[PDB]
Design a protein around this ligand. Structure first.
Ligand SMILES: CCCCCCCCCCC(=O)OC[C@H](COP(=O)(O)OC[C@H](O)COP(=O)(O)OC[C@@H](COC(=O)CC)OC(=O)CCC)OC(=O)CCCCCCCC
Ligand SMILES: CCCCCCCCCCCCCCCCCC(=O)OC[C@H](COP(=O)(O)OCCN)OC(=O)CCCCCCCCCCCCC
Ligand code: HEM
Ligand code: HEM
Ligand code: HEM
Ligand code: HEM
Ligand SMILES: COc1c(O)c(C)c(C/C=C(\C)CC/C=C(\C)CC/C=C(\C)CC/C=C(\C)CC/C=C(\C)CCC=C(C)C)c(O)c1OC
Ligand SMILES: CCCCCCCCCCCCCCC(=O)OCCCOP(=O)(O)OC[C@@H](O)COP(=O)(O)OCCCOC(C)=O
Ligand SMILES: CCCCCCCCCCCCCCCCCC(=O)O[C@H](COC(=O)CCCCCC)COP(=O)(O)OCCN
Ligand SMILES: Cc1cccc(-n2nnn(C)c2=O)c1COc1cnn(-c2ccc(Cl)cc2)c1
Lengths: 126, 248, 93, 123, 54, 385, 55, 93, 50
């Protein structure tokens, strides 16, 4: 995996650019609705793999109202596939509700892990 | 490679043993041994076929005992250690014309005629290739080809030139049932007989294939019904969410 | 023996997910539901729906590889004919 | 190893002997007539090899039959002189063993046949 | 009757699917052989042995 | 507690096929691993009953297979179920590996489970080659000549592996006798690697087609997936029975019904259908030492796959560009098998060379570039700025 | 026998069974050591040994 | 997996014996003790002491079975000699 | 014959010893039997045929 610090370093440079966001953002909105995760009642941060110690740290620090709602969306998405159906269009995720709710907990767990690791490998002399 | 170096493609005739429910024609196996004994056994062997396997398939017991007795087999030695011969019995194998391989090439201008016990299953085409090989010699070669001395043209052989000449002609055997022995009629019966020599289990195999497929299809249909009954409670399970009151 | 290194799965009672609160579920026995209900409106209509979603990710890579094979095949039959006798030379060596 | 004496191979008989599990080409020939086949020049062919280590015994013929790709097998006493017709994927050859047909990159191997006591051990 | 007299007891439930496994075995084996030797009538050895009765 | 949970031996059966927690949304692609356990049992059982009638001497080997076909009571059923069962064993294993390449099963924490699977695939190729040389047909002799001559190109040790593999100077009687003794043995090494395979599975469990955590909805193995495993077993045995009883020589070659001859070469040497994609990788390299390296590198490049996938989502369910290039790789593997069954002619030497380039560029170039492109496309299509 | 006395079918099937039973023995040896691991060994005194153990 | 039925052995820390209190132990390193001290006062005496305890439980069952074999053997050599020719009759049948 | 060289005789003696026996050869170009003298790879013959 790449890192979320590296993704946002590249992804912010595209958005503070007048000619780059002209080209790439119409392509990126077509990539989202051709993925089809909103039709299963899912945001994007539900799809992130969680078997690593940075991602296990960010799930403990979540508030427990957002932690209970995420566990119901995942259970609803497993029952939807074994019936091989989609949800009704009343219950799809709209484009305003797909927020990065887990990105701020992730980005500060990574900046603390980088700072701890570059203080264990030190070459201070006299 | 060119189509002259691959050989012509044999067509698809309609053999009576094609299909999943068909049997060999045992009157065309019986007439096929008559063309082997009179035209074919002069140069080719049948080394994988025993005498006893013909009883109940194309001849009776007293006929195969009479057929095997006109050949000489080597016996265990006498009380002085000298060789000894004996007539044939049912457990023996059908003999071939040559004692060794050098004597076979010496009578066929260097070429070696193969063994015909497995020739159906060892050729691309099967029954269609051995039939079309025999009834496919032209009366004259095509214009422009140059044959070696002592060769014959046949377009079903890869390369065009073969060391076997045409051996089937009209009315060269006389059948016992009274069937007219034409060129295509006798060529049909050797290929039905020679396919039995490669596959003697053919009629037994398709009868046990009937019992296995009927049993396994009624087991496959019942497992689809049984699975959907035991999986009914999971597919109809429901889920409601009410958000909890927030000071836990 | 001793306990080993920890994993990301447990057993019944301590499977190792987040805590749940406020979800209800209902079900009815199989002995009360009608035999073979979901045999229509599903492969005649539902697998006909699932095919139509995921087919264009299969048929466009398939069409490129079948155009490449059929076009490369008919140039081999041309090179081993009488009309393609001079072009077999100056190409192979 | 197979021992050959100076009594038991006459002039024109190319027998393909199965020596050491491998085919071989064995006959005696006149020491004059290979002046007819390879009188072209030195290096009109792929590799520069005409006569020097062709036969260290200058009045005999010995050649292996293992090819570079597969190990294909020719017919004997057929050709321009009665040499090599090897219709497998390619080349025919000559009295020597170099090509008249086909690409055929590398040369067929000469085995090590020696001379002991008027006996000739092959291999 | 049925299931509690025919498919419940374990010497009936299992004592029919192992006892009926033999009576099914032979009548299915006999009826398959009668269909095969009638679909291919005229080509067997039994048919052409009665034709050489001379 | 119950007796099936307190016994030392019954608890292993209960913890693996009775009370094992499964994700409730897995589909019929997760049934290929149980069906491979049935394939190994059929091959071991039918081969032991055929080894009672077989002779491994080079002058008795071809005729003893004919003795099983003609003389042994129901001997034709044993051979046909054995020769056709090996093709069905390789077909399910190609579908088993392609599922885990699709749903992302080779990533953490299942890297060790993917590495033991690559070792099983090499031992299954070695097993099928050794047993094909035991019939001693005309395809058996020249397939063993071509393969064993490849090891004479190893630098500074070349004429010592090949003279130790032959037991002599060519493919002869010491080669056939030692190939049957090794053929009895490697199916028992495969069965011990299968036990170690299921141990690495039990500590983490299976994935699911959604690709997310499955610890929120689990059902047991017994009475729900045993009756779903039963559906594909009865479909397997019915299509296998259609080949053994109605078309038993369709997945074969007629030149194996000629006894092998070191003095006559066949006009066309072609392997079985499951070695044709790897045979075409070998003939594309004009060097001899570089050709044998590339054919073995086509299986060891599966071990670089946990490192080149730079994606943050597991699987291919919601990835548009990664679903397109998965079927470029599939049909390039069916084009490679068709090149390896053709002659070496000149439209086909360039088609088989470019298609070998697409094999290695998928793992090392196409996957790490398309992975990071979809990480940036998921980000700027969500973050409002 | 595969026939009427000790003959050629007897010797050919005895070697194929001789290759196989040493691999059944090795699987029974694995099951043997599993039953040992849950209780351990005894001692020549014949009493409990959970008071003095070395690795 | 799940926990299974309980045994009579544990592992390091919970081996499963009685609780101990009031026993002390001492030891010295092997690098400080003299090399091969207990090689005399060991088998030249110790094992000469351990043999003398447990030998009479071995040698009395051994002497009965060697008297039975030697006495039964010499009656077989007598029956197959010339002096024992009449007693071979009236005994075997 | 070859196993005696270096144990009880030399190489020229065992080659001379093996040459006074007749062994059967592969047939000629007509398929007739043929004999040959002995070599080192042969086995020591016995007096009776059966
Ligand atoms: C060599 C022979 C070995 C024999 C076994 C091989 C089987 C491997 C085939 C690949 C496979 O695993 O199929 C999975 C996938 C469909 O799986 P799914 O869970 O998404 O949908 C299940 C359904 O919705 C509910 O199926 P349901 O549970 O409701 O009914 C059971 C079904 C049984 O059918 C099967 O077993 C499917 C193999 O009964 C019927 O359909 C009645 C038919 C008369 O299939 C597909 O999506 C596309 C299939 C293409 C296969 C390509 C093979 C290339 C060689
Ligand atoms: C190097 C050695 C590695 C092994 C060999 C590599 C390739 C070997 C090829 C043999 C296998 C052929 C198929 C590949 C395996 C399929 C596994 C797979 O892709 O399964 C998941 C896929 C998704 O289908 P769903 O609609 O159920 O899921 C919704 C979206 N995820 O389900 C599907 O299958 C999609 C439906 C399309 C049918 C798939 C088969 C297509 C038929 C042509 C394939 C060519 C085979 C001759
Ligand atoms: C009914 C009679 C015969 C049948 C069905 C028959 C069938 C065959 C077949 C199938 C082949 C092999 C073709 C191949 O290799 O692809 C063959 C080859 C041959 N047959 Fe016959 N044959 C018959 C009679 C004869 C006779 C009477 C002779 C000689 C007098 C003969 C001489 C040969 C020779 C020399 C070959 C080798 C051809 C070659 O390799 O070029 N055959 N025959
Ligand atoms: C994973 C297991 C196995 C595989 C993939 C396998 C594969 C093969 C194959 C492909 C053949 C060639 C058959 C043909 O083309 O006609 C063969 C032959 C043979 N194998 Fe196996 N085999 C396996 C297990 C075994 C075992 C364990 C034994 C011995 C106990 C065995 C005994 C034989 C025998 C006797 C032959 C003889 C030739 C024949 O029957 O055709 N096999 N094997
Ligand atoms: C004789 C050979 C094999 C057997 C018996 C076998 C058996 C199994 C079984 C029973 C499962 C669990 C059920 C399932 O997930 O479908 C499984 C999963 C798996 N196998 Fe195999 N397998 C074999 C070969 C292979 C090979 C050749 C590979 C890869 C190169 C492989 C990689 C995997 C992986 C990664 C999984 C986990 C997939 C997941 O959980 O999503 N296995 N195998
Ligand atoms: C290939 C055959 C066998 C192997 C490899 C084997 C191996 C072992 C091993 C390693 C132990 C551990 C304690 C020790 O080393 O003494 C042991 C203990 C034991 N074995 Fe075996 N054994 C075999 C056969 C047998 C047989 C034939 C019997 C009895 C009929 C048996 C009964 C036992 C018992 C009762 C113990 C426990 C003894 C104790 O803990 O005091 N084993 N075995
Ligand atoms: C995902 O969930 C699953 C799952 O689906 C499955 C199927 C399994 C089970 C899978 C297996 C058990 C595969 C393992 C298979 C083996 C290790 C093969 C074992 C080897 C054999 C059975 C060969 C030995 C056979 C014999 C010795 C009998 C043949 C010989 C005979 C009959 C001798 C004949 C002679 C005479 C005189 C009769 C799981 O463990 C599991 O949980 C992970
Ligand atoms: C028709 C039914 C439905 C349709 C098809 C489905 C078929 C269902 C039947 C499947 C067959 C049952 C599977 C058998 C089983 O219990 O699986 C266990 C195998 C998995 O591995 P393991 O043995 O658990 O390893 C577990 C391990 O404990 C084994 O090793 P260990 O004992 O720890 O080592 C001790 C030896 C020490 O050796 C040394 C020296 O280190
Ligand atoms: C390398 C892999 C080897 C394969 C191992 C796979 C798992 C083992 C096979 C699974 C089936 C086991 C069937 C055994 C049935 C239960 C036995 C039993 O009741 O336990 C025993 C009795 O077993 C025996 O006497 C010998 C068993 C012979 C095994 C021959 C195969 C009863 O033991 P008990 O009830 O006191 O429970 C104490 C738990 N330690
Ligand atoms: C050449 C040829 C020609 C004719 C028949 C066969 N052949 N050998 N075994 N089988 C089953 C088969 O078809 C073959 C062998 O083809 C190939 C191709 N790759 N390999 C291969 C790959 C890896 C290993 Cl470790 C061993 C062998 C073997």
């Amino acid at each position: 995996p790449q890192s979320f610090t590296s993704i946002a370093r590249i992804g912010d440079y595209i958005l503070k650019s007048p000619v780059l966001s002209k080209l790439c953002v119409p392509v990126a909105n077509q990539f989202i609705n051709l993925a089809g995760y909103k039709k299963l009642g899912l945001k994007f941060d539900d799809l992130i793999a969680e078997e690593n110690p940075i991602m296990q740290t960010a799930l403990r620090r979540l508030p427990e109202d957002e932690s209970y709602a995420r566990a119901y969306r995942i259970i609803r998405a497993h029952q939807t596939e074994l019936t091989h159906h989609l949800l009704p269009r009343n219950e799809w995720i709209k484009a305003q509700e797909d927020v990065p709710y887990l990105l701020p907990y992730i980005l500060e767990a990574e900046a603390a892990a980088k700072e701890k690791d570059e203080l264990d490998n030190i070459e201070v002399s006299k | 490679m060119t189509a002259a170096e691959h050989g012509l493609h044999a067509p698809a005739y309609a053999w009576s043993h094609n299909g999943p429910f068909e049997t060999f024609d045992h009157a065309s196996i019986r007439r096929g041994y008559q063309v082997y004994r009179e035209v074919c056994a002069a140069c080719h062997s049948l080394d994988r076929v025993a005498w006893r396997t013909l009883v109940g398939v194309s001849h009776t017991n007293e006929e195969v005992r009479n057929m095997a007795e006109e050949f000489e087999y080597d016996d265990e030695p006498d009380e002085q250690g000298n060789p000894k011969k004996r007539p044939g019995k049912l457990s023996d194998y059908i003999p071939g014309p040559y004692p060794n391989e050098q004597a076979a090439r010496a009578a066929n201008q260097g070429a070696l005629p193969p063994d015909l016990s497995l020739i159906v299953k060892a050729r691309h085409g099967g029954c269609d290739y051995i039939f079309s090989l025999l009834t496919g010699y032209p009366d004259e070669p095509p214009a422009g080809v140059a044959l070696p001395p002592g060769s014959n043209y046949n377009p079903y052989f890869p390369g065009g030139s073969i060391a076997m000449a045409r051996v089937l002609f009209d009315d060269m055997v006389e059948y016992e049932d009274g069937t007219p022995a034409t060129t295509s009629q006798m060529a049909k019966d050797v290929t039905t007989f020679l396919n039995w020599c490669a596959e003697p289990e053919h009629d037994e195999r398709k009868r046990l294939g009937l019992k296995t497929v009927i049993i396994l299809s009624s087991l496959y249909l019942l497992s689809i019904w049984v699975k959907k009954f035991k999986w009914a409670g999971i597919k109809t399970r429901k889920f409601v969410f009410n958000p909890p009151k927030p000071r836990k | 023996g001793p306990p080993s290194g920890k994993t990301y799965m447990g057993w019944w009672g301590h499977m190792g997910g987040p805590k749940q609160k406020g979800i209800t579920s209902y079900a009815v026995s199989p002995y009360a539901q009608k035999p073979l209900q979901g045999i229509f409106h599903n492969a005649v209509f539902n697998s006909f729906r699932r095919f139509k979603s995921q087919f264009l990710y299969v048929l466009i890579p398939a069409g490129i590889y079948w155009y490449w094979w059929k076009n490369g095949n008919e140039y081999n039959e041309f090179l081993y004919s009488k009309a393609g006798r001079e072009e077999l030379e100056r190409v192979n060596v | 190893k197979v021992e050959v004496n100076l009594a038991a191979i006459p002039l024109g008989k190319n027998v393909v002997v199965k020596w050491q599990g491998k085919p071989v080409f064995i006959r005696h020939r006149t020491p004059h007539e290979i002046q007819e086949a390879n009188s072209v020049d030195m290096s009109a062919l792929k590799d520069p090899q005409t006569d020097a280590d062709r036969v260290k015994d200058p009045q005999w013929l010995i050649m292996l039959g293992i090819c570079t790709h597969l190990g294909c097998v020719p017919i004997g006493e057929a050709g321009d002189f009665g040499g090599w017709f090897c219709p497998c994927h390619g080349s025919h050859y000559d009295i020597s063993g170099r090509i008249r047909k086909g690409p055929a990159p590398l040369n067929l191997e000469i085995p090590a046949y020696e001379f002991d006591g008027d006996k000739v051990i092959v291999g | 009757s049925l299931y509690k007299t025919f498919f419940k007891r374990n010497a009936v439930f299992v004592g029919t699917i192992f006892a009926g496994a033999f009576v099914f075995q032979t009548v299915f084996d006999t009826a398959i052989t009668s269909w095969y030797e009638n679909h291919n009538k005229g080509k067997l050895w039994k048919d052409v042995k009665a034709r050489i009765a001379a | 507690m119950a007796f099936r949970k307190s016994n030392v031996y019954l608890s292993l059966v209960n913890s693996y096929i009775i009370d094992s927690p499964q994700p409730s949304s897995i589909n019929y692609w997760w049934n290929m691993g149980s069906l491979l356990g049935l394939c190994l049992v059929i091959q071991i059982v039918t081969g032991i009953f055929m080894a009672m009638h077989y002779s491994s001497n080079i002058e008795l080997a071809f005729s003893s297979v004919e003795h099983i076909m003609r003389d042994v009571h129901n001997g034709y059923i044993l051979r046909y179920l054995h020769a056709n069962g090996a093709s069905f064993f390789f077909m399910v294993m190609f579908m088993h590996m392609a599922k885990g390449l699709y749903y992302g099963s080779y990533r953490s924490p299942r890297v060790t489970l993917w590495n033991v699977g690559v070792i099983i695939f090499i031992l299954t190729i070695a097993t099928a080659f050794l047993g094909y040389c035991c019939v001693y047909g005309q395809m058996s002799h020249w397939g063993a000549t071509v393969i064993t001559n490849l090891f004479s190109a190893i630098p500074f040790v070349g004429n010592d592996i090949v003279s130790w593999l032959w037991g002599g100077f060519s493919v002869s009687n010491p080669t056939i006798q030692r190939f049957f003794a090794l053929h009895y043995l490697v199916p028992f090494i495969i069965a011990a690697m299968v036990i170690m395979h299921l141990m690495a599975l039990h500590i983490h469990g299976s994935s699911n087609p959604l690709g997310i955590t499955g610890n929120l909805d689990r059902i047991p193995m017994h009475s729900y997936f045993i009756f779903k495993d039963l559906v594909t077993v009865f479909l397997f045995m019915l299509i296998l029975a259609l080949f053994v009883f109605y078309s038993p020589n369709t997945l074969g070659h007629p030149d194996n019904y000629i006894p092998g001859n070191p003095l006559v070469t066949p006009a066309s040497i072609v392997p079985e259908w499951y070695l044709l994609p790897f045979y075409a990788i070998l003939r594309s390299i004009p060097d001899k030492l570089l050709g044998v390296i590339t054919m073995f590198a086509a299986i060891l490049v599966l071990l670089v796959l946990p490192f080149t996938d730079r994606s943050v989502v597991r699987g291919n369910t919601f990835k548009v560009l990664s679903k397109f290039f998965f079927f470029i790789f599939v049909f390039n593997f069916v084009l490679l098998g068709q090149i390896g069954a053709c002659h070496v002619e000149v439209p086909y030497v360039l088609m088989g060379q470019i298609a070998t380039f697409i094999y290695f560029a998928y793992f090392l170039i196409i996957v790490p570039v398309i992975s990071t492109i979809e990480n940036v496309l998921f980000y700027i299509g969500r973050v409002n700025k």
